[PDB]
Design a protein around this nucleic acid. Structure first.
Ligand SMILES: [Mg+2]
Ligand SMILES: [Zn+2]
Ligand SMILES: [Zn+2]
Ligand SMILES: [Zn+2]
Lengths: 84, 156, 93, 551, 107, 171, 268
RNA sequence: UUGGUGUGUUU
């Protein structure tokens, strides 16, 4: 109906900072609610530093749904998008 | 809680409410005729679905009281066991061979097609009474339908 | 936390902070809607757990929301002036 | 957790369906018909059912639960009532649009004085915008003077041939002037609202669709009120005058005045009536319904109170700077703020703000009890609420509040994984920081927490330029996040190191101020020499110095 | 229009990026005529109803909201604030899913 | 009356469930929550088709709460009765006020005023039954009734029958 | 007035309805903070200066590369196979000079706010790679030409492959590619700056990455930042100027107080 | 733990 295949993807393949902000907030909220961490834990035990330790390595199980302004949307995985 | 695709009920007048219109829609938006099921059809689907679910849980390796235990929760065990025994004692065409024969014989509203198969009848007089919707349709063979249906009906 | 504070929050854009400010550290308030006539007329008994849109005989098409209590105040004031805000929870066209 | 559980699932609003209200749907939504002007029974303790304070509307007393929803006052939204007016009235807010509508159509059959025959009208029909559609029909019909009996062999469209009157507006009272015939007596007469109701009930849905309305939402016999609703008393709750007597809200006074004029209407048609005693009591009814929604109408004196003050209408509760929207919804007052007078402190970083201890005691932050923060949070319990660094509450997994000033036994409390604890304002948290008024997108900036005695706010002095603060007594606020989500929102966008460069003028707007600047210019003039000994300290002050002096 | 704004700002030595003035002078000629900044500009747009009501004249424009059966899908900002919603910008211009793709890659 | 119905269920998942078996948990959760339950809108949901292959979709993270919202679409066999619908049944009990007949999931009450006059309740008989001369309605008797009224408790539905009409009665 | 304007994931500028206002954000796609005022060197000066600085000549010996700076200098002089490359590139820059002279920046004031500033990267590589020496280099002219030409098709602002995408791509970064070829032409690099190969490859990769990192971000609520950042000098500010002139320009009057003409006369 | 008016002072 709306959705586009993952090959016509003409939006920018970067994370930008607003996207980055929401990913950090939501991943940190999950790991605050006892979602176990994929990366090592040295001294970074506060959840925001845990989230930046993940995004440093690009280890994030989320999906951006950019609503393109028709209404359709490009399901970008985190794994493919280039971390700034 | 649980919702459907669609976003005074009188079975005699074929008024089935907003949920059971003639044209339904599947989870892709495609148009589809309403799927009304005779007692015999329903017996095949429910029994097939229950044993297929049990096989999938066993990685790929009969009785209704055992087949109803596949469900989860005592409420579901109850409704399914009560439904199988009802279908076990009123489904005329208890195998898919006869069932497809009845399927081709009948294939006319989908509600009537399921009633004619579920309710055994002797004559046309008994069919247009219990199913008063067949009145103004004007296309019988009904009798040989009922005769073939009754002949296809296995003994018990 | 006035207007122009909200303006600079929009300029930064992190509106999730704004949904903290004007929902959660304030008059967080919970209402119900009948999904057919779209209104908040649905009478709420909870320990008996029953509902009735009495202009519709609707007993199933029922949702709750999370709106500011002053927004609800707007709605009751308006319906007491005969304008009908109806809140349908799906895009229609 | 802050709400009691319900089974209807949470969804956000998507579409506002604005529309009008039928008289019907008002009659079908309520629970009670409204009758009696007195509030009390006979001053007898639970006032009169049938008066204005029906407990079936929702009780405005803490200790008597509601008698319709069966909840407390904390949860009951209220329920609408409605007062059956005997005489139908105008809504006060539609009188120009109702004016235009009775400028449009026939007054006998109620039909539009144009069809698709006249082709400019037939072109105006094709418009997808309702508003300028009704403008174009309003334009082309104001010249059309006669209801065509014929189609504009008799093709009788529906009209009788009687002319169409000229619609004046005079406040609440309309004056239609037919050209009752050429020239003969013009009967400029008051358009009684019930006559127009009987007109409006005779409209085809096509004339609804052409004239800028919609049938299931805005049917223009609904712009005349037969039944004016009653809001529940949360919207007019009684105020403790001096803690025994309740002065009422002015809505209660006005609905009492409406119900008094209602009964003095129904008193006249049940006895000998001298025909303008009828007219004045009806016009007084219309007056009371007018001031229920608006006490600002031009030309007429205001509705007045028992002090000499004007009445708080519904219109006065919505317009103005301090109405419900600009004063309560678009912007409002909130909590977890703080406020003081500031002081400079150059012995600081750029993202640090001094926190007086008592403000750290009062405010808090809910840190989630996780599996990596149990020990300190238990210690913050063991400081309790009179000792920084510490805690004030444990919210359980359900919604249980334990105020630790009112609890003897902190020592026997284990905590569970996933409970909630609000500890105090400890170091290194985001705060928002902010000075009224905001003027550019740096005027709110995030920071970090440094805890100091001697109760003022500390700053760096390089941040003095963006907030535009001096130290002759400014107030700067301090909002606090109450979630993890907003913490990361602030820490990645509204932090000072990410807002250095202002797109106002694509330059840094945070620089050097008074002393550091004029001092460094006095320092690195050419003829300035320093001995080694003082230089030891001076290079010790740099946090980023490696450990190597220059040559 | 652009020459006017760049003049009367940069008379007192003050400096402005092009793209901000550009966005202002192009919104002022969105619709083929000068959509000036008053109530007459924005409220005579067919945009979101409460967004237009939040600026001026909220009584009349609410009466024209309910008076003509408008459908406001609430994509304006002021709606989604006063309906207490995830507003559509910043972090909320876009939803976030869970991912069966990467959680299949996970053990 | 049996149908195939395309239904869906909104499931909200707490972040502590964000683990490697998330989709399988949701599929089991759908079955536990939907199978055997009754609603006046669809009827009894008897069994869900193809339960182990249900596509649960992706969970949308709810802003501000961290929890994920799944819309689990599925197709089930549902049974809803109708006023006017003739059905067969098996009588479960007989009492002075009529008899009760099991029509699949639910139970139907036929009162004495909706039983033909020649059928007389005989308690002395063993086993107790409504009897005539060539008619016999005891427990376990196949009967054909007509649903003349459906009442809804949203938990269990209640239907009242009748054999006071043509071609209805014992079979 | 602006409070909803959001730059979406197609580089456009819509309101709540979708009234698109600018097809490309700020006519460039570049974030508003991320500029400096630089010098597009090929605007000013005479034809003598341009033909002396840039015009390569591979037939005449002396107007070529003075051979101290390059290793391969035996392998060069006379080859028309490389001369036609350089004539095409000199005509390229005459096209750019006519372009930036006569279309865009007509009065020739060359200082303009333009993104990522390359000169700083060049001298950063210089101080990294110890770039004195006054030494032969092994970096050839065809590698320079193909580096510039393979740069000018890697500055994707508007990504995708439809015809208006490629057209809007070349409409987008014409001035920025004009900047790069205004600086990194062959005689300027291999005389005035003296790079090596490895410095030049690092220059290419870094101009890639930072003109990627100064694209505007999507969802920058540019109307709101815009409105505040125009209101802010309005705080601290014979023709009317200042606040009433700003008020009249916003609230658009049919009667402003003292209108004016700018009337040129003809050249004779 | 009142409302509602009104006055003076802070940035
Ligand atoms: Mg000052
Ligand atoms: Zn309803
Ligand atoms: Zn109540
Ligand atoms: Zn007429």
């Amino acid at each position: 109906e709306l959705a586009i295949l993952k090959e016509e993807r003409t939006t920018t393949p970067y994370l930008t900072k607003y996207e980055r902000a929401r990913i950090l907030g939501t991943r940190a909220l999950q790991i605050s609610m006892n979602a176990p961490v994929l990366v090592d834990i040295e001294g970074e035990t506060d959840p925001l530093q845990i989230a930046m330790k993940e995004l440093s390595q690009r280890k994030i199980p989320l999906v951006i749904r950019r609503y393109l302004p028709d209404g359709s949307y490009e399901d970008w995985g985190c794994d493919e998008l280039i971390v700034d | 809680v649980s919702t459907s695709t669609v976003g005074e009920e009188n079975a005699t007048l074929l008024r089935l409410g907003p949920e059971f219109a003639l044209k339904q829609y599947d989870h892709d938006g495609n148009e589809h005729d309403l799927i009304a099921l005779s007692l015999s059809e329903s017996r095949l689907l429910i029994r097939e679905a229950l044993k297929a679910r049990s096989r999938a849980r066993n990685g790929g390796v009969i009785d209704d009281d055992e087949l109803a235990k596949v469900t989860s929760g005592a409420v579901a065990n109850g409704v399914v066991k009560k439904t199988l025994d009802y279908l076990n004692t009123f489904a005329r065409f208890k195998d898919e061979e006869t069932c497809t024969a009845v399927d081709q014989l009948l294939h006319l509203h989908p509600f009537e097609i399921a009633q004619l198969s579920s309710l055994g009848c002797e004559d046309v007089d008994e069919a247009i009474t219990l199913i008063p919707s067949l009145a103004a349709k004007k296309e019988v063979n009904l009798q040989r339908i009922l005769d073939e249906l009754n002949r296809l009906e296995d003994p018990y | 936390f006035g207007e122009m504070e909200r303006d600079c929050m929009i300029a930064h854009g992190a509106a999730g902070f704004l949904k903290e400010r004007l929902m959660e550290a304030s008059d967080a308030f919970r209402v119900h809607v009948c999904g057919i006539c779209g209104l908040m007329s649905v009478i709420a008994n909870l320990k008996k757990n029953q509902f009735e849109c009495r202009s519709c005989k609707n007993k199933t098409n029922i949702y709750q929301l999370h709106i500011p209590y002053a927004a609800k105040l707007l709605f009751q004031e308006l319906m007491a002036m005969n304008i009908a805000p109806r809140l349908y929870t799906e895009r229609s066209g | 957790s802050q709400f009691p559980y319900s089974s209807a699932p949470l969804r956000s609003v998507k579409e506002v369906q604005f529309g009008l209200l039928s008289p019907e749907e008002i009659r079908a939504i309520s629970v009670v018909k409204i009758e009696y002007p007195e509030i009390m029974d006979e001053s007898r303790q639970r006032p009169r059912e049938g008066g204005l304070n029906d407990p079936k509307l929702g009780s405005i007393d803490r200790n008597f639960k509601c008698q319709t929803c069966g909840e407390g006052m904390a949860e009951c939204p209220g329920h609408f009532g409605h007062m059956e007016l005997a005489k139908p009235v105008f809504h006060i807010g539609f009188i120009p649009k109702i004016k235009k509508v009775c400028e449009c159509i026939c007054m006998n059959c109620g039909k539009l004085l144009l069809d698709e025959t006249n082709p400019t009208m037939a072109q105006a029909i094709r418009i997808r915008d309702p508003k300028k559609r009704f403008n174009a029909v309003w334009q082309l019909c104001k010249t059309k003077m006669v209801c065509e009996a014929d189609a504009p062999k008799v093709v009788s469209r529906g009209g009788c041939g009687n002319t169409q009157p000229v619609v004046r507006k005079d406040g609440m009272k309309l004056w239609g002037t037919w050209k009752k015939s050429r020239d003969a007596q013009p009967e400029r007469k008051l358009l009684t609202p019930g006559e127009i109701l009987n007109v409006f009930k005779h409209i085809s849905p096509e004339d609804c669709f052409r004239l800028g309305f919609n049938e299931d939402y805005a049917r223009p016999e609904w712009m005349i009120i037969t039944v004016l609703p009653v809001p529940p008393p949360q919207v007019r709750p009684s105020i403790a005058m001096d803690e025994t007597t309740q002065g009422q809200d002015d809505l209660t006074h006005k609905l009492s005045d409406i119900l008094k004029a209602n009964i003095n209407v129904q008193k006249l048609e049940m006895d000998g009536s001298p025909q303008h005693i009828i007219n004045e009591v009806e016009q007084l009814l219309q007056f009371h319904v007018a001031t229920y929604m608006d006490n600002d109408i031009a030309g007429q004196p205001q509705a007045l109170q028992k002090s000499g003050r004007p009445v708080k209408a519904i219109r006065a509760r919505l317009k103005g700077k301090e109405g419900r929207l600009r004063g309560n919804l678009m912007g409002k007052r909130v909590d977890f703020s703080a406020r003081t007078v500031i002081s400079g402190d150059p012995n600081l970083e750029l993202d640090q703000v001094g926190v007086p201890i008592s403000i750290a005691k009062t405010l808090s932050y809910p840190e989630t009890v996780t599996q990596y923060n149990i020990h300190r949070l238990t210690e913050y319990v063991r400081n309790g609420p009179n000792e920084h660094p510490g805690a004030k509450y444990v919210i359980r997994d359900n919604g249980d509040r334990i105020d630790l000033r009112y609890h003897k036994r902190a020592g026997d409390i284990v905590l569970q994984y996933g409970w909630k604890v609000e500890r105090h304002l400890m170091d290194d948290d985001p705060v928002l920081f902010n000075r009224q008024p905001s003027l550019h997108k740096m005027s709110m900036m995030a920071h970090r927490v440094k805890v100091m005695p001697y109760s003022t706010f500390r700053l760096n002095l390089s941040v003095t330029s963006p907030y535009n603060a001096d130290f002759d007594g400014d107030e700067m606020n301090l909002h606090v996040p109450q979630s993890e989500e907003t913490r990361a929102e602030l820490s990645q966008l509204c932090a000072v190191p990410l807002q250095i460069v202002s797109p106002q003028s694509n330059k840094p707007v945070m620089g050097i101020v008074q002393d550091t600047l004029c001092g460094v210019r006095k320092m690195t003039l050419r003829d300035t020499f320093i001995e080694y000994e003082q230089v030891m300290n001076m290079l010790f002050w740099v946090p980023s110095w490696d450990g190597v002096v220059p040559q | 229009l652009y020459k006017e704004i760049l003049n009367v700002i940069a008379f007192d030595g003050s400096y402005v990026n092009y793209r901000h003035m550009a966005l202002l002078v192009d919104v002022m000629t969105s619709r083929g005529y000068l959509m000036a900044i008053t109530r007459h500009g924005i409220n005579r747009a067919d945009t979101g109803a409460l967004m237009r009501c939040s600026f001026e004249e909220t009584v009349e424009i609410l009466f024209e909201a309910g008076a003509a059966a408008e459908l406001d899908d609430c994509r304006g900002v002021s709606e989604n604030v006063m309906l207490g919603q995830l507003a559509p910008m910043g972090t909320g211009a876009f939803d976030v899913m869970i991912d069966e793709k990467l959680l299949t890659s996970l053990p | 009356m049996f149908f195939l119905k395309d239904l869906s269920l909104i499931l909200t998942l707490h972040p502590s469930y964000f683990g490697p078996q998330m989709n399988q948990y949701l599929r089991e959760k759908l079955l536990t929550d939907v199978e055997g339950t009754c609603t006046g809108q669809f009827g009894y949901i008897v069994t869900v088709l193809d339960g182990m292959n249900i596509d649960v979709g992706k969970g949308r993270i709810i802003p501000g709460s961290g929890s994920a919202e799944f819309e689990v679409k599925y197709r089930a066999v549902v049974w809803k009765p109708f006023k006017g619908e003739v059905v067969d049944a098996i009588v479960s009990n007989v009492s002075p006020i009529g008899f009760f007949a099991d029509v699949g999931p639910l139970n139907v009450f036929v009162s004495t005023r909706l039983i033909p006059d020649n059928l007389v309740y005989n308690p002395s008989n063993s086993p107790p039954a409504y009897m005539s001369n060539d008619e016999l309605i005891t427990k376990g008797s196949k009967v054909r009734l007509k649903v003349v009224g459906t009442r809804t408790d949203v938990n269990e539905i209640y239907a009242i029958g009748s054999i006071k009409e043509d071609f209805l009665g014992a079979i | 007035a602006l409070e909803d304007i959001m730059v979406h994931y197609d580089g456009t500028t819509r309101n709540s309805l979708g009234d698109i206002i600018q097809f490309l954000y700020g006519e460039d796609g570049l974030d508003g903070t991320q500029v400096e005022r630089q010098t597009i060197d090929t605007i000013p000066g005479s034809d003598k200066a341009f033909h002396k600085r840039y015009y390569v000549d591979l037939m005449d010996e002396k107007n070529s590369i003075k051979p101290d700076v390059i290793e391969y200098a035996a392998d060069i002089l006379g080859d028309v196979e490389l001369q036609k490359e350089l004539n095409s590139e000199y005509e390229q820059l005459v096209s750019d000079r006519k372009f930036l002279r006569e279309i865009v920046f007509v009065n020739g004031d060359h200082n303009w706010p333009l993104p990522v500033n390359l000169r700083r990267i060049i001298q950063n590589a210089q101080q990294i790679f110890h770039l004195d020496r006054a030494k032969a280099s092994d970096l050839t002219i065809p590698e320079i030409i193909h580096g510039v030409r393979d740069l000018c098709k890697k500055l994707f602002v508007l990504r995708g492959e439809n015809e208006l995408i490629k057209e809007a791509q070349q409409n987008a970064t014409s001035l920025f590619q004009c900047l790069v070829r205004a600086r990194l032409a062959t005689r300027r690099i291999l005389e005035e700056f003296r790079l090596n190969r490895d410095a030049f490859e690092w220059v290419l990769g870094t101009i890639e990455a930072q003109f990627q990192r100064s694209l505007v971000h999507p969802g920058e609520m540019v109307g709101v930042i815009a409105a505040q950042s125009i209101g802010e000098p309005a705080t601290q500010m014979n023709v009317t100027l200042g606040v009433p002139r700003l008020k009249e320009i916003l609230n658009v009057a049919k009667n402003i107080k003292t209108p004016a003409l700018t009337v040129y006369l003809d050249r004779e």
